Each structure stands twice: as structure tokens, then as C-alpha cells.
Structure 1
Amino acid sequence: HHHSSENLYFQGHMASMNKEMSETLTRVGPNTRMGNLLRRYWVPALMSSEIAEADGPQVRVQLLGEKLLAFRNTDGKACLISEFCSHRGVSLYFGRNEENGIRCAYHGVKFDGDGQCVDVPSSPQSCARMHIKGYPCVERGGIVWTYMGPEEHKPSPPELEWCTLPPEHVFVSKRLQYSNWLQAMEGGIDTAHVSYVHRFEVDTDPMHQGVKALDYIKADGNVKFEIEQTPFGLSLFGRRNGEPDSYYWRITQWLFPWFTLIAPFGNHALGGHVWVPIDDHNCWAWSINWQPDQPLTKEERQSMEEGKGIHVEYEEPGSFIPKANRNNDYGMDRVAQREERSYSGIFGFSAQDYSLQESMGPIQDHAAERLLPTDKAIVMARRMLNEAALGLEQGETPPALDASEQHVRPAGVLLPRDQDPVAWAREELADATKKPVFSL
């Protein structure tokens, strides 16, 4: 136990974060508690498509405070190294990807994919003092993943369902988000939000519309939660009223430290997020859709490419800033707000969510938060993160390192009000990726 560990409840409501814990969770740079924790997991760096071909243009990428450079060498292996030449500090973005390496444009020093210095023109014997940081990589889901932690503790690469399926079952997008990773992830472990800001989007949008779940979601925002701790993270049982006999359970899966699997809408593709910290004020927000049984159709895949569903349209090509952003007021339409075609005045799943999270300021004011029951999932995920971060300081091994425990699924069920859903899911969600999808 460490003083920082906040109590779960205070005066009979859930308790907010104390100052130190606020910091433990938000500060992600090198040699921070959370910086060190996050380094132990495989990290999604960028998409394979951004560095498609060998000897192709390198791209700058910033993760967990460090500034890096991604490129694909001559053999075709995706590599990731530090952005800066060890010589006089110039950027290797201006260098030359060729002959299995990056060669600095200033004086010709060359580094390979592991950041080993392999040529120094003026001084061949200096190689060993010119090494820079290079990080191992693997490709899965159409994403380049990197391992940024101590060499001896590198785990098995992740085996989430969208990472194991064949390519054309899967579709991935990413968006830059002008806020700290925490508040953003917090948004996808809060199913009560869907009943308010998304109330009217849920009907027009092709990845969501025309399924029976919507009648129940629309008609009750008041979500009671049950939370079960597991080898991979948490399972979130979000209860709403079904019929008068019954309850609509949405079960979303939180896979520590930064993944969700969202409970389905009908036979529409399954959805998921990742959030990756760029610094303490920004993050990559990843969105994944995938179908377990058939390929994605063309009307599915194309709808995603146009930026419907949990995806977005971009400001300019290869921008990764959304079309709706803090410069155009996120497209606010007050007229639409009055006529009840949009709750917030903003259009689009993604925008409706990040508009609000950006508006909190880069880091949410944790001091001024006053929590409610709908925040049960959030509070527990915070504890798991804090206790892992603090535990790693003290030499404990962090949770969820074992990829085989990540073969799981979200779900929806209608159930009588006396049936216990945790028991139900013991029965039904064992070996869940072999069964079809539990849906409504």
C-alpha cells in the first residue's frame, strides 16, 4: 500500500483522485511511474500503410514522451529508432533510407534498425560510442507495434481478436486527440454517455442503426454497473431496463492498460479502441472494426473509409487531424440541436465524444471532479493502473502480460431481472471467439 492509493468511497459516494495519484496516471514520459509501466506492454506506433514499401519515406512518430522515427528497411522489416543523430543532434527525418539503414544527411553517419551505428566516415573505430536507441517491432492488425521496455522483459506480442484475424476481416484508423490519454480512455468505459450525446446519431449511422438495442439504450441513461476483475483487465456489465420482466446487459471488455472491446450493435461489425500517449497533453486514438465470421463487405469498408461510425473524415490528406476540431467549433449546429437531430449540436460518433473531452482542457481538473454511479468502471480502472504503476516501482510484476488471456469478446443479452449476469457469462463467454457473437 502507498499513501497515494485513494479510498474507493468517501462519505458514501465514489472518491476522486488525490493530487499525487492524479500525477501518477497522467505523466507518461521517460522515467515516470506510468512511463515505466506503459513501456512494459507492446505499443501501437503507426499503421503499416504509412510506411508501405521498403526504402520508403521514413515518418516521425512520438510516443510516451520520446520522439522517434519509423521506417521500413530494405529487407522489408519495420523499424523504429530515435529521431536524432548521435553526432550533432540533427534530425534523421532528413537522412537516407537505403541499404538497411538511415544515413544522416549532415556528415553521413548511418544507423541500422536496432539503432546500432554501422558506419562512421571520419572514424570507423567510433561506432560503439555513437549508438542510439532502437526498439524492436512486429506487425499485427495492420499496425506496427514496438516494445520500448528493458530488453529482458519483452512479452509475447498481443493476441487480441483483431490482431489474429486475416486482414480483410479488419479495419483500423487513428485520430490525433488534443488531450491526455487518461480522460479519453475514460470515455470508452462509460456506456451511460451513449444515452445522451449519441442519442440521435445512433439511428442515422450505418454501423449502428436499426437494431433492437437502440430502443433500450435510448429509453434509459441510468446505468447500474457490475464489475468483475479478470486476468486481462476488467469486465464491465452495464445494466439498463429492457422489457418490464428484463434487463439489457451491455458487457464491454477493458483490456489493461489501454484497450476496449465495445458491446455489439446487432450484426454490425464489432468495434474497439486503443489510446496511446504522445505526451502528457495529447494522444493517438485508435479505432478498430472487425467481423469474426466473414470478410468486411465493400459497403462496410467504404463507409469506414468515408469516416462514419467510430471513424472520422480528415481535415487534409495524411493529416490525422479530424475534419471537426477545435478550430471550427467542431462544426457546431445549434439549429440541429433545437430540432433534436443532435444532442450536443455536433455530428459524428467520434466528434461528439472528443469534442467534450478536448473541452475539459488537455488534462481534466481531477480536483474539481465530483463522481457519480455511472463512473464505477472508471474508478476501478484507475485503481488497477495506480496499483500497477506503484507496484512496479517496488519490483512487483505488472498485470496482463500474458497474450493468451486476451482471446475474449464483448456481448449483449436480454435477461430476466433475477438472473445474475456474471454467472451467465461464466457459462456463455468461455471460449467466446469460437462461438458466434452475443448480440441484439
Structure 2
Amino acid sequence: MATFVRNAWYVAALPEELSEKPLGRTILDTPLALYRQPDGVVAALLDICPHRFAPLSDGILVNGHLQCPYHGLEFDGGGQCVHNPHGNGARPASLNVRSFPVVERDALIWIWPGDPALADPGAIPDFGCRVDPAYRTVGGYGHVDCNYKLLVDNLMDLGHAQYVHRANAQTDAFDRLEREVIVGDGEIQALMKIPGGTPSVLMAKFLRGANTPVDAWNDIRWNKVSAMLNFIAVAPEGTPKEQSIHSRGTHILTPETEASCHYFFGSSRNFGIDDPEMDGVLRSWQAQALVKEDKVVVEAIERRRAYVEANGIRPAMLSCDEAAVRVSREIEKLEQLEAARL
């Protein structure tokens, strides 16, 4: 296949998307059949029947077993063929289908598409806020026609806020930014404190009313490959970013093909937990910003890749590209390390 970092955990779906009716979805050019078994456990099988290659995702569950819609072979969550209705009903090993390591955690469905012997659920990113009773989480799914790295670049960058999300987050006090970049093992963080300018649209609706040279906060954490969690906050007194009013944003990308990807987004609130109106506001921003703004930009950039590559054009970095560049380099190393292993 192309260049993907297969040895890592990726989100394949949101829990609400799975049920007894299989979901067919492609991850890193690998077609998967994702479904929840009767015992509530999620299973992930290669969406290719071992017999004649029909999509198992088009089948239904029979006694908790996924049945191939073509000739009826039945499989368990581990991919073992548990029933062959033909002939003497023999089930040779050649009839088992490939099963992928899968972990449901933090209201996310994680999958390991690479070497199964190398998985290890302990390396899965921490998105605990998504199931923390102290937070209220709302979110969704989006499909985007761009290489996932373009969206990683996007999420790791604050600059476009002023233009891409013009109508929304356009701080007239964005000329006085400050951004710290922390590098760790398979982890990078861009932290920013913002003490100035009475909001505009976004934070406004999140807020109520305040003013002082020290309030806002905008941060983002990146974990190995393409899983990010941001931190959007605002508060009164010289109180730490803690005790503040904030939303931790889930922004996770999973490559589908070399030129397309899956986008799992969400907002985990610390305020208005029982307020349905805020839920709307948040979902209204996600649909606007992430689906009606960032998508348009990255999809247009993807359409220009052929030209940039055909010619020897390289990007010209600005002062605000530090975080994105470092993440980009880490992802590159991971690709090389894996290619070397091969």
C-alpha cells in the first residue's frame, strides 16, 4: 500500500455508529466490517469473506455471529469461522477471516491496523474527559477528501482562525499572540495564554460578560500519528487556567486512502452541562467550522498536490508554523522507522 504508519492505534468509529448492523469503513486502505456483538463487545473484521470475497459488512448477525450475505459462512468476533452450511460442514483454518485488535475507550473505537503482535492497549491516547461525568460531550463524524496530514497541519495551527473562521473566531487582538511549544515522546503541545480583547462571537456565546488583561486560553495536544485534543477556555480573576470555564476538543483523524480521511470531532464541556442550548451552539460551530470551513480549504489544497509535486514546489513556513512543522517531522520519522522495519 502507500505510506501509512500502520503500527499505531487509530479511531475507526464513534460508539454511536456501531450496532448489530455492520458498518463497512476503510482505514489505511483496509476495508473493515465493524459491529457490536450481542454481549455489547465491538468486533472488527477484514471486510472480505475468505470464501469468495463478498463484503461481510453487508451481512447480518445470526446468533451473535456475522453471516456472509453470499453463501452463509458465519464468523465470531475473533474472525473464526463458526459455521459452514455446505457439504459436511467442515471448517478448515483457511475459512477464518482476519480480525483486528479493537478497544472501546473514552467513547471512541480504537483499532490497530498493523502488525497485531505489536498492539498493546496501553499505548492508546488518553481522552478521559469524554467519559468524565464532570464534562458534557457532544460530537460527530465527517469525511474529508484530503490527505490526513493536511488536516493535522490545520488543527495544529491557530493562524487561520482569523480568516478561515472569519465570521466566528476573528480576534482583533490576535496581533499580540504568544505560543509555547512542548516536545515529548510521541507527543507535542502548543500552549497559549490570551490576556486581551473582549471576545467577538465564539467565546462570547460560551461566556456571559467580563473584561481584564488576562483571561483566554487556547491549547492543543498531539499524540503519535494523528490524535489531537485541544483546550479552549476563559475565566475571571488571575485564577489559573484551572477552575476556568473550558471545552476540551477531540480532533482525531484516520486515513482512509492516500487522498481521503475520517474526521472524528467532539467537545467536552465543563460548563452548561445541563443546558441543551449550549449543545446546539457547539454542534453549530462544529458543522460550521470543521465541516463548512476547514474542509473547503484542505480539499482545495489536496486538488493542488499533483501540480506542486509535478513541479518541485515546497511550502514556505511562517513564524506560526512551529508546532505543525514539528508534528509533521515526527509523523515522517514514524513512516521511515516503519519502512525501515519492513
The bucket for the TM-score relative to the shorter chain is: 0.7 to 0.9
Asked whether the 8 Å contact 1:226–1:237 carries over to 2, the reply is: yes
1:106 aligns with 70
Deviation at 1:293, TM superposition (A): 7.3
2:156 aligns with 189
Structure-2 separation of matches of 1:268 and 1:247: 11
Q: Is the partner of 1:85 in helix, strand or coil?
A: coil
Identity among equivalent positions (%) equals 20
- 1:262 equivalent to 2:230? Answer yes
Q: Is the partner of 1:199 in helix, strand or coil?
A: coil
Higher strand share: 2
| TM-score, normalised with respect to structure 1 | 0.63
From 59, 71, 96, the counterpart of 1:131: 96
Structure-1 separation of matches of 2:265 and 2:31: 23
Asked whether the 8 Å contact 2:192–2:219 carries over to 1, the reply is: yes
Deviation at 1:280, TM superposition (A): 0.8
Deviation at 1:281, TM superposition (A): 1.1
Deviation at 1:273, TM superposition (A): 0.6
Deviation at 1:235, TM superposition (A): 1.7
2:114 aligns with 149
Q: Which amino acid aligns with 1:194?
A: A
Rate the CA distance shift 1:126–1:226 in 2: closer, same or farther, 3 A: same
- 1:158 equivalent to 2:125? Answer yes
Q: Which amino acid aligns with 2:144?
A: Q
Q: Deviations over 1:94-128 (max 9, x none)?
A: 32312121112222211111111122233544431
- 1:357 equivalent to 2:298? Answer yes
- 1:51 equivalent to 2:18? Answer yes
Asked whether the 8 Å contact 2:25–2:32 carries over to 1, the reply is: yes
- 1:282 equivalent to 2:246? Answer no
Q: Is the partner of 2:333 in helix, strand or coil?
A: helix
1:327 aligns with none
Asked whether the 8 Å contact 1:192–1:222 carries over to 2, the reply is: no
Rate the CA distance shift 1:46–1:271 in 2: closer, same or farther, 3 A: same
Asked whether the 8 Å contact 1:191–1:238 carries over to 2, the reply is: no
Asked whether the 8 Å contact 2:186–2:330 carries over to 1, the reply is: no
- Residues 26-425 of structure 1 aligned to structure 2 (within 5 Å): 29=1, 32=2, 34-35=3-4, 37=5, 39-52=6-19, 56-122=20-86, 123-155=88-120, 156=122, 157-166=124-133, 169-202=136-169, 217-221=171-175, 225-238=179-192, 242=196, 250-266=218-234, 267-292=245-270, 295=273, 297-304=275-282, 307-309=283-285, 311-312=286-287, 348=289, 350-362=291-303, 364=305, 365=308, 367-368=312-313, 369-395=315-341
Structure-2 separation of matches of 1:270 and 1:185: 17
Q: Which amino acid aligns with 2:17?
A: E
Q: Tell me how many residue pairs correspond in the alignment.
A: 309
Deviation at 1:289, TM superposition (A): 0.5
Q: Deviations over 1:63-108 (max 9, x none)?
A: 1110111112222211111112111122223323121211122222
Q: Deviations over 1:237-266 (max 9, x none)?
A: 4577858x9997743222222122223142
Structure-2 separation of matches of 1:218 and 1:195: 9
Deviation at 1:173, TM superposition (A): 0.8
Q: Is the partner of 2:232 in helix, strand or coil?
A: coil
Q: Unaligned regions of 5+ residues in structure 2, if any?
A: 198-212, 235-244
Rate the CA distance shift 1:296–1:181 in 2: closer, same or farther, 3 A: farther
Asked whether the 8 Å contact 2:33–2:56 carries over to 1, the reply is: yes
Rate the CA distance shift 1:240–1:303 in 2: closer, same or farther, 3 A: closer
Cα RMSD for the two superposed structures? 3.0
Structure-2 separation of matches of 1:228 and 1:270: 18
Q: Is the partner of 1:170 in helix, strand or coil?
A: strand
Rate the CA distance shift 1:302–1:227 in 2: closer, same or farther, 3 A: closer
Rate the CA distance shift 1:287–1:40 in 2: closer, same or farther, 3 A: same
| TM-score, normalised with respect to structure 2 | 0.79
Q: Which amino acid aligns with 1:92?
A: L
Structure-1 separation of matches of 2:246 and 2:180: 25
